Design a protein around this ligand. Structure first.
Ligand SMILES: [Zn+2]
Ligand SMILES: [Zn+2]
Ligand SMILES: [Zn+2]
Ligand SMILES: [Zn+2]
Lengths: 76, 215
């Protein structure tokens, strides 16, 4: 199954997933392709913040769905 | 026009394990499972797909998922490139490619991309043209399928996508394949650091070993 991830820049990538994949797994795939550490990643789908322990199927994320990637910023 | 007609016509796909030959039906994902020996592999590079907690490679950062390990020139990665940059790889190496439809092409029933897919319809499957929007200069294909076509040429000619990487992509690639996060050594300026990474990558990490090549 394939899904899309886009940033506000408009850049879109395609990920190979299965519905059982955790959000953690998806962040790990983004790290693989984009070099962005999981701790810096916030993913959103249909306005919902996706939490690390849950799966794509928990959020009813289907084939060809688009997730939004927003970077996280933490103080020193 | 040779390159495109080959992409468009019905293609073969072979299980890398048992060697049974199939006709490729487009429309699904990159994850294939042999109906003869149940082996799982990637259509883009023929590498195995492991179930979670079954991957034998050490230092695997995605160990807890169904994944394979793909080389840098597999469609798995290259499909994320713009059509322009894939065209550049081909142009830099003097490989011709189509931007216009075939010579005496036949019109497509509805509209859109002529690539035949086995699509999921209510209560089964059905062969049908892609039908997605076809941008000018994409040879009568949609965005995703046009990139697939360009990637078939790129693979057939053994072109290295790394020649076009920015330093960040080199670092992302170095970490993926050599498991070390690189950094400039002292005294190294940015042009030297970039060139060092491209050279270390070239000589330690081959292109896809199981991607069919031309001669
Ligand atoms: Zn087989
Ligand atoms: Zn692959
Ligand atoms: Zn692995
Ligand atoms: Zn298409």
């Amino acid at each position: 199954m394939q899904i899309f991830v886009k940033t506000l820049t408009g850049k879109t990538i395609t990920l190979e997933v299965e519905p059982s994949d955790t959000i953690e797994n998806v962040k790990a795939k983004i790290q693989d392709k984009e070099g962005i550490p999981p701790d810096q990643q916030r993913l959103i789908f249909a306005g919902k913040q996706l939490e690390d322990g849950r799966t794509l199927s928990d959020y009813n994320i289907q084939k060809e769905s688009t997730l939004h990637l927003v970077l996280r910023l933490r103080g020193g | 026009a040779q390159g495109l007609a080959m992409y468009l016509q019905e293609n073969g796909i072979d299980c890398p394990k048992c060697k049974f030959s199939y006709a490729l039906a487009r429309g699904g994902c990159m994850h294939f499972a042999c109906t003869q020996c149940r082996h799982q592999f990637c259509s883009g590079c023929y590498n195995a797909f492991y179930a979670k907690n079954k991957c034998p490679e050490p230092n695997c950062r995605v160990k807890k998922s169904l994944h394979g390990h793909h080389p840098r020139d597999c469609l798995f990665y290259l499909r994320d490139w713009t059509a322009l940059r894939l065209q550049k790889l081909l142009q830099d190496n003097n490989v011709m490619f189509n931007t216009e439809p075939p010579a005496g092409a036949r019109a497509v029933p509805g509209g859109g991309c002529r690539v035949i897919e086995q699509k999921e319809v209510p209560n089964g499957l059905r062969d049908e043209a892609c039908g997605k929007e076809t941008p000018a200069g994409y040879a009568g294909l949609c965005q995703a399928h046009y990139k697939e076509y360009l990637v078939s040429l790129i693979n057939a000619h053994s072109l290295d996508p790394a020649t076009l990487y920015e330093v960040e992509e080199l670092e992302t690639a170095t970490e993926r394949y050599l498991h070390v996060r690189p950094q400039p050594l002292a005294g190294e300026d940015p042009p030297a650091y970039q060139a060092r990474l491209l050279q270390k990558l070239t000589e330690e990490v081959p292109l896809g070993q199981s991607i069919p090549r031309r001669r």
